[PDB]
Paper text:
The coronavirus spike protein (S protein), an envelope-anchored trimeric type I transmembrane glycoprotein, mediates receptor binding and the fusion of the viral and host cell membranes, which is treated as the main target of neutralizing antibodies and vaccine development.
After further data processing, we finally identified two major conformational states: conformation 1 (derived from peak 2) and conformation 2 (derived from peak 3) with resolutions of 3.21 and 3.55 Å, respectively. The C1 presents a slender conformation with a total of ~145 Å long and ~113 Å wide, while the C2 is a stubby structure with ~132 Å long and ~117 Å wide, which is ~13 Å shorter than C1 and the shortest among the S protein structures reported previously. In addition, through analysis of the C1 density map, there are 31 sugar molecules identified on the surface of the S protein, most of which are located in the S1 subunit. The RBD (chain A) interacts with the NTD (chain A) and the adjacent NTD (chain C), RBD (chain C), and RBD (chain B). This interactional mode between the NTDs and RBDs may cause the RBDs in C1 to remain in a lying state. In the C1 state, S1-RBDs are buried through their interactions with the surrounding S1-NTDs and S1-RBDs in the same or adjacent protomer and are not available for binding to hAPN. Specifically, the equilibrium dissociation constant (KD) of peak 2 and hAPN is 36.3 ± 0.071 nM, and of peak 3 and hAPN is 6.78 ± 0.105 nM. First, the inaccessible closed state (C1) can transform to an activated state1 (C2), which reduces the steric conflicts for RBD transformation to the “standing” state.
Residue numbers in the entry:
A (entry chain B): 244 to 292
B (entry chain B): 50 to 98
C (entry chain A): 50 to 155, 165 to 700, 710 to 810, 820 to 1033
D (entry chain C): 632 to 700, 710 to 810, 820 to 922
E (entry chain B): 535 to 583
Amino acid sequence: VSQTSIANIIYCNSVINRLRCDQLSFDVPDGFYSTSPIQSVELPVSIVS
Amino acid sequence: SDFAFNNWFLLTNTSSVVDGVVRSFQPLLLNCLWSVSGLRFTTGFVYFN
Amino acid sequence: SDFAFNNWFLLTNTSSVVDGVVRSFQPLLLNCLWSVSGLRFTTGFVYFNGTGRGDCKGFSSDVLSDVIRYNLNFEENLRRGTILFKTSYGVVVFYCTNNTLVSGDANFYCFVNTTIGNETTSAFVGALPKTVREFVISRTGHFYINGYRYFTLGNVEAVNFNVTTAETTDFCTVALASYADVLVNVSQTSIANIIYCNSVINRLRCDQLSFDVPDGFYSTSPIQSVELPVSIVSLPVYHKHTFIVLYVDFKPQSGGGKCFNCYPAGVNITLANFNETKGPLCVDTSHFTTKYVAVYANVGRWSASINTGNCPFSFGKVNNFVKFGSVCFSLKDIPGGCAMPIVANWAYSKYYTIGSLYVSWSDGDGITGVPQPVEGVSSFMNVTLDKCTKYNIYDVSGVGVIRVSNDTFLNGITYTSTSGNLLGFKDVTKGTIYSITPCNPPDQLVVYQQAVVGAMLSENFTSYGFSNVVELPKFFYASNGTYNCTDAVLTYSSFGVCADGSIIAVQPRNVSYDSVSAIVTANLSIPSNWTTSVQVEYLQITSTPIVVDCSTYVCNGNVRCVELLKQYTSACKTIEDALRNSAMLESADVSEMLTFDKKAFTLANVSSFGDYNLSSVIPSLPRSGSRVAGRSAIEDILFSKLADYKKCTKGLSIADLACAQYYNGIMVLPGVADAERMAMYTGSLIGGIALGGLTSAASIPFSLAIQSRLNYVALQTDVLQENQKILAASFNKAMTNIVDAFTSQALQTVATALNKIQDVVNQQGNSLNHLTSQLRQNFQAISSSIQAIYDRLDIIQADQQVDRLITGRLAALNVFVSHTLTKYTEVRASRQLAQQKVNECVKSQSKRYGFCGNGTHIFSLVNAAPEGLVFLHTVLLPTQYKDVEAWSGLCVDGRNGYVLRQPNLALYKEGNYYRITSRIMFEPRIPTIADFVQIENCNVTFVNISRSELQTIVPEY
Amino acid sequence: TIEDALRNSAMLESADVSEMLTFDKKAFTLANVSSFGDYNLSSVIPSLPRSGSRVAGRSAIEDILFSKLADYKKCTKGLSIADLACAQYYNGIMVLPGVADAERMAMYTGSLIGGIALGGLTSAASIPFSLAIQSRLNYVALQTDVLQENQKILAASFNKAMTNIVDAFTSQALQTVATALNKIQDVVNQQGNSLNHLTSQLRQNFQAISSSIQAIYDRLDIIQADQQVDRLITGRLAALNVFVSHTLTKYTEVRASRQLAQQKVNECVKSQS
Amino acid sequence: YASNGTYNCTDAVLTYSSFGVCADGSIIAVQPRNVSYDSVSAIVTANLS
Ligand SMILES: *[C@@H]1O[C@H](CO)[C@@H](O[C@@H]2O[C@H](CO)[C@@H](O[C@@H]3O[C@H](CO[C@H]4O[C@H](CO)[C@@H](O)[C@H](O)[C@@H]4O[C@H]4O[C@H](CO)[C@@H](O)[C@H](O)[C@@H]4O)[C@@H](O)[C@H](O[C@H]4O[C@H](CO)[C@@H](O)[C@H](O)[C@@H]4O[C@H]4O[C@H](CO)[C@@H](O)[C@H](O)[C@@H]4O)[C@@H]3O)[C@H](O)[C@H]2NC(C)=O)[C@H](O)[C@H]1NC(C)=O
Ligand SMILES: *[C@@H]1O[C@H](CO)[C@@H](O[C@@H]2O[C@H](CO)[C@@H](O[C@@H]3O[C@H](CO[C@H]4O[C@H](CO)[C@@H](O)[C@H](O)[C@@H]4O[C@H]4O[C@H](CO)[C@@H](O)[C@H](O)[C@@H]4O)[C@@H](O)[C@H](O[C@H]4O[C@H](CO)[C@@H](O)[C@H](O)[C@@H]4O[C@H]4O[C@H](CO)[C@@H](O)[C@H](O)[C@@H]4O)[C@@H]3O)[C@H](O)[C@H]2NC(C)=O)[C@H](O)[C@H]1NC(C)=O
Ligand SMILES: *[C@@H]1O[C@H](CO)[C@@H](O[C@@H]2O[C@H](CO)[C@@H](O[C@@H]3O[C@H](CO)[C@@H](O)[C@H](O)[C@@H]3O)[C@H](O)[C@H]2NC(C)=O)[C@H](O)[C@H]1NC(C)=O
Ligand SMILES: *[C@@H]1O[C@H](CO)[C@@H](O[C@@H]2O[C@H](CO)[C@@H](O[C@@H]3O[C@H](CO)[C@@H](O)[C@H](O)[C@@H]3O)[C@H](O)[C@H]2NC(C)=O)[C@H](O)[C@H]1NC(C)=O
Ligand SMILES: *[C@@H]1O[C@H](CO)[C@@H](O[C@@H]2O[C@H](CO)[C@@H](O[C@@H]3O[C@H](CO)[C@@H](O)[C@H](O)[C@@H]3O)[C@H](O)[C@H]2NC(C)=O)[C@H](O)[C@H]1NC(C)=O
Ligand SMILES: *[C@@H]1O[C@H](CO)[C@@H](O[C@@H]2O[C@H](CO)[C@@H](O[C@@H]3O[C@H](CO)[C@@H](O)[C@H](O)[C@@H]3O)[C@H](O)[C@H]2NC(C)=O)[C@H](O)[C@H]1NC(C)=O
Ligand SMILES: *[C@@H]1O[C@H](CO)[C@@H](O[C@@H]2O[C@H](CO)[C@@H](O)[C@H](O)[C@H]2NC(C)=O)[C@H](O)[C@H]1NC(C)=O
Ligand SMILES: *[C@@H]1O[C@H](CO)[C@@H](O)[C@H](O)[C@H]1NC(C)=O
Ligand SMILES: *[C@@H]1O[C@H](CO)[C@@H](O)[C@H](O)[C@H]1NC(C)=O
Ligand SMILES: *[C@@H]1O[C@H](CO)[C@@H](O)[C@H](O)[C@H]1NC(C)=O
Ligand SMILES: *[C@@H]1O[C@H](CO)[C@@H](O)[C@H](O)[C@H]1NC(C)=O
Ligand SMILES: *[C@@H]1O[C@H](CO)[C@@H](O)[C@H](O)[C@H]1NC(C)=O
Ligand SMILES: *[C@@H]1O[C@H](CO)[C@@H](O)[C@H](O)[C@H]1NC(C)=O
Ligand SMILES: *[C@@H]1O[C@H](CO)[C@@H](O)[C@H](O)[C@H]1NC(C)=O
Ligand SMILES: *[C@@H]1O[C@H](CO)[C@@H](O)[C@H](O)[C@H]1NC(C)=O
Ligand SMILES: *[C@@H]1O[C@H](CO)[C@@H](O)[C@H](O)[C@H]1NC(C)=O
Ligand SMILES: *[C@@H]1O[C@H](CO)[C@@H](O)[C@H](O)[C@H]1NC(C)=O
Ligand SMILES: *[C@@H]1O[C@H](CO)[C@@H](O)[C@H](O)[C@H]1NC(C)=O
Ligand SMILES: *[C@@H]1O[C@H](CO)[C@@H](O)[C@H](O)[C@H]1NC(C)=O
Ligand SMILES: *[C@@H]1O[C@H](CO)[C@@H](O)[C@H](O)[C@H]1NC(C)=O
Ligand SMILES: *[C@@H]1O[C@H](CO)[C@@H](O)[C@H](O)[C@H]1NC(C)=O
Ligand SMILES: *[C@@H]1O[C@H](CO)[C@@H](O)[C@H](O)[C@H]1NC(C)=O
Ligand SMILES: *[C@@H]1O[C@H](CO)[C@@H](O)[C@H](O)[C@H]1NC(C)=O
Ligand SMILES: *[C@@H]1O[C@H](CO)[C@@H](O)[C@H](O)[C@H]1NC(C)=O
Ligand SMILES: *[C@@H]1O[C@H](CO)[C@@H](O)[C@H](O)[C@H]1NC(C)=O
Ligand SMILES: *[C@@H]1O[C@H](CO)[C@@H](O)[C@H](O)[C@H]1NC(C)=O
Ligand SMILES: *[C@@H]1O[C@H](CO)[C@@H](O)[C@H](O)[C@H]1NC(C)=O
């Protein structure tokens, strides 16, 4: 955003784009980063008492 | 990419930021490309369809 | 001691620890030794009494036993048994039938049926253990099987054990016991041994959460634990009383036949103060004594009483010196006010409350509850003087001892310290003032060889069994031994302690040094042949980097938590960005510092050296593997004296401690100083000593090399080199001595290095040992578990109590990062110094005093060590000095006087002829004319020689 | 962990500072001012015992500096009201006696000062101070004059400069002295206000009804008293951990200054650089 | 370690103390800095440079 007006956007779909958006920047310098890919669906429920 | 979107605006309940980089939730699905070409007074009723 | 107690177990309500050291409260009183020998089915009823048919052994007091423990020593077979519990309210029995039928035999079904009075009830066992090795019971009624507690019965008057065993060797024990405070060592969740916390030394040891605390200094506070006289003081004002009394008269028709909690004849409970208008009754006279009042006629086993509510002040304690601005106690409800409930118990089995005592209050200094019922025109100010006491002085409470003082101080009435604790007060009556010393100031004690010896105190008294209390400046000191001042086995800057505890004043290190040798044309002494020595130093070089995943650490896998965090990515990005950039920076530096020479690495073969036999330093050959190098002897000795995640998502083992940390999100990177290139670097440096500039690449004998290095200090001028052959015998002996010291000041130096290494390792570990503990505590939330928080609440009020967790966690994380940066920025200095001296001492002899050793420096070895290096500075120390008679200059028969071209030389008259020697070694050199220089003005103070005898000294003509 | 860290660090640093302080009885006796000469460095030399069995006494520049800048034995007994320091003991802080005691400190300083007039001689006797300066000069270059005007001229400027600077205590050199004095008062303030900040925090109660634990017990029954108690200690432990983590950061940094000091005292003090 | 490229060990475009990575993602063990230095030249009455 420049002068409160939009300039461009980046969809957070791909893994690389995900990391880039997480970086709050563009063009992260070549290096090492950490990530956690997580399942987002219902899972079987188990109980023991 | 490269869309000017000069008219296009952000949405904020609170005070707007200026000239910053921000990730957020926006209603940006392309959906129907135009859906209003040649708009006239009898625009009809569209109900999230 | 030495009891196996394999069957014996711990007791824990919560999850059991495994393989740890823990001090806790356990029921471990020996009481009756056995009390169950030859146990048969008719075991009888024992009720927390000495009435146990067994050999108590006479160490048993037989007063009372808090708990009953059953230890079973039978083969792993099922034998019919029943358990009977007798309580005044009811008799409960436990039965199990092997057969499928509910009656079964007198698929396994167990039924425990409890009958109260004439009513019989049936209960469900549910889960049945495959095998039970131990049984625990208590008077409170807690029931423990194999440590965990399944359920707790209300009360047990007596216990009867219906166990029948055909086997003559039926079982090992069924005993009684009582609580105590002990420490335990647990391996694989199973006990190994314990330590009773009775003696003072044992008390300190248990406090140390360890055994065998190292000899040193510790602090202790011995405290009286009995009732003390109570003293009160208030401003004298003629007491005008107010009595608030309440008449609860529960009086039901027994309640055991139908219901006790049904509030029968429960009705009127009231206090005379109610008004027909019923305006809230707030007292006006400041002095009032609240009392519970009389109670209704009480029948067996049941009662009613008041309970603490939600107000700040508990009713009944209000009279104990409290303040209030407006009581306004009311029987009905009061808007915006606290309320308390009275409940009734039928043998502690039915709880039924009653709306009671609406109270609201303003804060103030006028109204004050007084315990003493009598209030009137009287004189009282009880004040015990010189004993430990409680006290209330002008609405301030505490404990201590009162001392009379002499200080006018008529300005006011109370004096308080900066901390907020009052120091002294003045009587209203006369003007005297009294101080308030605390009862038990901390005392400093000393321990050595796992026993206490000596003690620093404050009072001129022998508190312990010590036979002497030597008064000393700034403190007193007790000891149990005579003063013989033989030596010190411990030391502090001011003083050291003797073996028996005698105190001694330290005499600093007797040493001696040298200085410039001013030419004075008189007698002087030069050092003769030296002896070798070795000094050891240690330098921190690197820090094990750590990395953290923000979102794992705080979110812990909850998607909703992740989404609430999503708006804070502006914040926590800085943390991991800083840690990562700092790690890669320092690793780049340490990788830039490590050079290598293949030409010289091969030279590290011990055959190249000679008599020195520095076997330990040289790197080991590969152990039939394709590895460039192996750690040296001093290396694995040091490591000895001091995991893969690949196995932490797979495998069949339970996760390890390190493995757990990964789950939480901390992640320790592999260390920068890996052994391969570390050993190559060290070996190359070591091989750079025997390599000198040659047209060929071959080596030369090590002996010649030392001579060359010596030449640097001065021109060694001897043809038959005794030093080369003598110093090695001292050198290799010193080395064997010091490696033995690993496995004479040099010894204390080695002790200092070792202490420093264990220091840095502890300093590194307890950082994250402190970090990972803080998430176990919830700052303000109902519970730590985010998942549980979501379970306990709907969408509107769950996130609201969630976010205050992360608001604290982020702060703790920012603290951690801000302290890690402060570790790196400081270790960088030590890195600078290390690189600055390794390339100086290791490569080229220094001419700087005190940088490479106590005296003149010859060469230095280097090896690796945890996150650091270690040096071996070989030096030279003068064995003896040779005296000699000199001349500060020369005068020819002509006016011209001659002097020397550089100062470091000095003439002397060895015999008839004159010899000029070095100032730093006794090596002598021939005189010649080229070594002199001319100055016109003759000083008479020099040698006086003409041109004739000049030809006798130097062949001029 | 708190007290274990503080104790181990204290004994470590005290062992180091005790390892650094050497002594020479041969040279300590040489500190007699009669040995020097026109220089009259009266201020530096250590004072003789004041009719007491004390090895040494502080020098003039020493007590001037201290001037410009208790026993617990009397804190459980006596008739006086407790002093501020005394109060701290009651609370539980405890300042250990300083490592640099005056006796061995003065012996060390005096021995170093006496190492200047001592040169290698067959006998143990001294030589005139004048000859010594000439030898040190030779190091820079072969002083070649027979009638040594420097020895006699520079002393008149030297003793005058010294009187000027001791007056400055009681020209860039002046600003240098001002800087040192400012640095000393800086470190002393920096040391005091640490525990002056510590001991104040227990006067405030983080969330409890009142600070006084005894009062808290008076105002409540067993079930709801410990519950409002523990949140006191939950804060107090945090404050304590902050204090220890900042003390370790003071030690680990002062160690560098110690290194530099030992590195230059043995260089400049002993042999011209 | 996963990678999408073959191992040819040409060079390293990124590095960490234990190891470095190739341009295509192939992993490589670092060889420390080949250097050489000198030392005292003991008089030995023989060939030297
Ligand atoms: C100004 O302030 C206003 C204040 O009102 C803001 O308006 C609110 O904005 C929030 C955030 O966008 C919005 O919450 C979202 O609502 C939409 C619509 O909800 C309905 O759609 C879901 C399917 O997505 C259906 O299940 C159902 O019809 C939803 O309605 C229900 O909401 C909850 C949660 O689903 C239900 O339990 C209730 O029963 C109720 O019927 C959602 O699209 C969005 O859902 C996302 O989060 C939920 C909860 O975690 C999750 O279950 C959804 O799957 C989804 O999460 C992700 O899934 C999609 C799948 O396509 C994936 O692509 C993304 O990763 C998704 O994030 C969420 O519930 C809220 O309703 C608004 N307020 C109201 C009252 O309308 C406004 O935005 C502010 N403007 C700014 C920014 O200034
Ligand atoms: C699993 O979770 C359960 C939860 O219930 C745990 O069970 C509780 O364990 C605690 C701690 O052991 C236990 O508290 C202790 O109770 C026993 C028995 O109390 C009765 O004995 C005392 C004499 O000691 C009598 O005065 C009176 O009969 C006691 O009963 C009364 O309790 C309070 C306090 O005394 C009274 O005010 C009430 O009126 C009530 O009638 C006690 O032995 C123990 O007492 C110790 O502390 C108190 C309070 O400070 C002190 O006054 C005692 O003198 C004693 O302190 C020290 O004195 C002895 C002297 O020999 C000295 O040797 C030690 O230094 C002592 O520490 C305390 O009251 C609690 O009752 C249990 N719960 C119930 C409901 O029974 C179980 O432990 C958990 N298991 C684990 C570890 O996983
Ligand atoms: C974020 O948004 C800002 C706003 O558009 C971007 O900055 C703008 O970037 C353009 C180029 O992308 C700049 O234009 C260049 O400016 C120079 C100097 O005037 C001109 O000579 C060039 O020909 C070109 O026009 C422009 O100055 C700059 N303006 C501002 C206000 O920043 C920025 O690049 C965007 N960043 C990302 C990552 O999207
Ligand atoms: C705390 O409890 C553990 C568990 O018993 C103690 O460790 C065990 O200590 C024994 C000796 O006391 C070790 O036995 C020795 O092991 C070696 C190597 O196997 C063997 O050669 C010896 O002959 C002897 O058996 C045993 O290995 C060790 N086991 C474990 C799991 O630690 C520990 O000493 C106890 N500490 C205290 C202070 O009580
Ligand atoms: C470097 O440090 C070492 C250790 O501090 C010094 O070693 C020691 O040198 C002193 C002389 O200052 C020796 O003292 C004397 O020993 C004789 C014979 O026992 C005794 O009769 C004298 O009265 C005096 O005590 C001491 O023996 C010696 N110790 C060792 C273990 O070597 C060394 O002198 C220091 N070098 C310099 C230049 O300061
Ligand atoms: C100071 O550091 C620089 C850079 O680390 C060193 O420069 C390099 O010196 C090495 C010798 O140790 C040279 O190595 C050789 O080069 C020849 C010709 O390419 C090759 O045939 C050999 O097998 C070997 O690789 C290297 O070329 C040279 N590099 C540069 C950029 O100058 C310098 O030697 C270091 N000085 C000292 C005293 O360590
Ligand atoms: C300290 O000194 C006391 C006496 O000076 C020693 O006491 C004896 O200790 C045994 C063992 O408890 C008792 O049976 C004697 O009655 C004690 N004698 C007296 C006179 O009290 C004690 O053992 C000494 N302890 C140490 C560690 O030195
Ligand atoms: C829109 O409003 C105008 C009047 O403002 C009206 O004439 C017209 O009919 C309206 N459109 C529709 C589709 O009803
Ligand atoms: C939109 O389509 C859905 C699905 O056919 C239908 O239920 C709905 O009625 C449509 N919209 C309107 C306004 O009818
Ligand atoms: C245990 O002994 C006490 C004291 O004599 C006694 O009151 C009690 O009745 C005895 N136990 C039983 C079950 O009677
Ligand atoms: C269970 O209770 C019933 C009814 O009181 C009784 O008949 C039966 O014997 C009990 N079971 C036992 C004691 O195992
Ligand atoms: C355990 O039981 C066996 C069974 O024969 C017995 O011989 C032995 O004495 C018992 N050991 C004990 C009670 O410690
Ligand atoms: C309260 O109730 C009891 C029994 O119901 C009765 O004896 C008494 O008179 C009542 N009133 C007062 C003031 O106690
Ligand atoms: C206060 O002093 C009087 C006079 O000795 C005494 O009777 C009374 O019991 C004392 N009170 C207490 C609580 O000791
Ligand atoms: C200390 O105790 C000793 C023991 O005899 C006694 O002689 C001395 O007077 C006491 N001193 C003080 C100040 O109490
Ligand atoms: C120890 O004391 C005895 C008797 O007082 C004395 O003869 C001996 O010299 C002393 N020895 C030491 C090493 O203090
Ligand atoms: C060490 O120093 C003291 C100081 O006076 C002296 O008495 C003694 O001779 C010395 N002892 C040794 C063993 O050097
Ligand atoms: C010291 O010098 C004198 C000259 O005055 C000489 O007589 C004496 O022999 C010398 N001492 C020694 C030990 O040579
Ligand atoms: C020094 O040299 C003399 C004579 O060669 C010899 O007797 C003495 O043992 C030597 N001392 C040492 C420490 O080598
Ligand atoms: C000398 O070298 C041999 C070779 O292994 C070794 O066993 C021996 O311990 C060495 N001796 C010394 C004094 O280093
Ligand atoms: C020169 O000789 C004189 C003779 O009195 C002597 O005092 C002085 O120290 C000498 N100066 C030197 C040797 O530099
Ligand atoms: C040597 O010194 C003596 C003593 O002053 C003097 O008389 C003599 O002339 C000198 N001889 C020389 C300078 O050749
Ligand atoms: C200084 O030395 C002189 C004689 O050389 C002596 O009279 C005096 O007592 C010494 N000063 C001290 C403090 O010992
Ligand atoms: C010289 O020494 C005397 C001896 O006390 C002293 O009073 C005087 O101030 C000194 N003068 C200077 C300039 O130091
Ligand atoms: C009075 O107080 C002062 C100081 O508080 C103290 O020095 C003195 O000993 C006390 N007693 C008398 C009788 O002065
Ligand atoms: C790359 O791989 C090819 C085929 O394996 C091989 O011929 C070539 O030498 C390799 N080059 C480098 C630089 O690794
Ligand atoms: C660098 O070192 C390795 C180590 O064996 C060696 O094989 C190679 O010849 C060297 N390469 C260069 C380019 O110096």
